[PDB]
Design a protein around this ligand. Structure first.
Ligand SMILES: [Cl-]
Length: 240
């Protein structure tokens, strides 16, 4: 962990406990946590913290409960607003590994219904609430009450069958999670759970759902431009 965190850090990064925070916009921070995958080394996973009026919204947990509890501490001391809800973008450890910590803190948690149905078989704890989606991919508003600037969109199966994505109203930022890879990536990373036929279209759907967004946030790379989308789709075309 320690060597790779040092190599990864750039000028705007801030360290707290085991976690790295970078401010992306006036009310949006990227949280980064690391897991040592033996054979592979240390792997970063990015999520978001969003301040919306008098409350905080979290997109994705850290890899573990203890790291997630730390994110909550950093919020309590650096922002000092209550965390109203968390949204997790699919049933994998990088996004849902810290669920028990959120529930211990009394934080309302939301995921795709399908993420919650898959969570037990993926070794994850389900979120308390289930999001559903229309045929056009947009979240059904009654399943996502009081989400403020968070615009939740299900682009279809790609990285996983359940992957969801989030735009932040009032910013240039859209979060592709593990679906989108950066613009110079040599591969699509972990395709173990991937839908090869639909991935390209899903990546393109994410792109089209947030057509203005110029800062694409993803799980294992620094924020990139829209070329991350195009490039991810091009790589995915070679799968089908
Ligand atoms: Cl947009």
């Amino acid at each position: 962990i320690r060597p790779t965190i040092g190599q990864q850090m750039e000028t705007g990064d801030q360290r707290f406990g085991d976690l790295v925070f970078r401010q992306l916009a006036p009310n949006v921070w990227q949280h980064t946590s690391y897991l040592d995958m033996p054979g592979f080394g240390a792997v970063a996973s990015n999520g978001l913290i969003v301040r919306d009026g008098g409350r905080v919204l979290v997109v994705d947990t850290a890899w573990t409960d203890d790291q997630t509890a730390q994110i909550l501490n950093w919020i309590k001391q650096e922002i000092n607003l209550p965390v109203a809800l968390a949204v997790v973008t699919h049933a994998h450890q990088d996004k849902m590994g810290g669920m028990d910590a959120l529930h211990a803190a009394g934080i309302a948690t939301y995921a795709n219904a399908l993420s919650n149905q898959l969570a037990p078989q993926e070794g994850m704890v389900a979120a308390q609430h289930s999001l559903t989606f229309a045929a056009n991919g947009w979240v059904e508003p009654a399943t996502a009450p009081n989400f403020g600037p968070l615009k939740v969109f299900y682009p279809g199966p790609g990285h996983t069958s359940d992957n969801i994505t989030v735009g932040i109203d009032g910013t240039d930022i859209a979060f592709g999670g593990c679906l989108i890879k950066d613009s110079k990536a040599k591969s699509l990373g972990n395709l173990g759970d991937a839908d090869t036929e639909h991935y390209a279209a899903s990546a393109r759907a994410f792109g089209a759902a947030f057509p203005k967004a110029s800062m694409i946030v993803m799980s294992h790379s620094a924020p990139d431009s829209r070329a991350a989308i195009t490039h991810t789709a091009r790589m995915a075309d070679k799968l089908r």
